[PDB]
Amino acid sequence: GVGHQPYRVVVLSFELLHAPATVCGPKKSTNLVKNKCVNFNFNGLKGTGV
Amino acid sequence: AYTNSFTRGVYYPDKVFRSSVLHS
Numbered sequence: 001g002v003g004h005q006p007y008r009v010v011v012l013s014f015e016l017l018h019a020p021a022t023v024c025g026p027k028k029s030t031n032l033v034k035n036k037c038v039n040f041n042f043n044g045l046k047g048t049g050v
Numbered sequence: 051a052y053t054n055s056f057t058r059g060v061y062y063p064d065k066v067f068r069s070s071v072l073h074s
C-alpha cells in the first residue's frame with residue numbers, strides 16, 4: 001500500500017538564538033550609512049533608526 | 051571533605067549585552 005511504502009524524510013532543525021548567525025539565503029549587503037535616519041536589516045533583524 | 055562555596059558559581063545566562071541594569 002501507499003502508506004506502507006518507504007519514505008525518505010529529512011527534518012530540518014534551526015535555532016533562534018542571538019549568537020552570530022551563519023546560515024542564510026543569498027542577500028546582497030549594501031553600504032553602511034551612519035548618522036542618518038535609515039531603514040536597516042541586520043541578520044534578519046529589521047528596524048528603522050540612526 | 052566539604053568546604054564553603056561562598057558566592058561562586060555565577061555564569062552569564064545568555065549572550066545578550068546589558069549595561070547598568072538589575073536583571074532577573
Ligand SMILES: *[C@@H]1O[C@H](CO)[C@@H](O)[C@H](O)[C@H]1NC(C)=O
Binds near residue numbers: 051052053
Ligand atoms: C558545611 O560543611 C561544614 C564542614 O563540613 C560544616 O561545618 C557545615 O555545618 C556545613 N553546612 C551546611 C549548611 O551543610
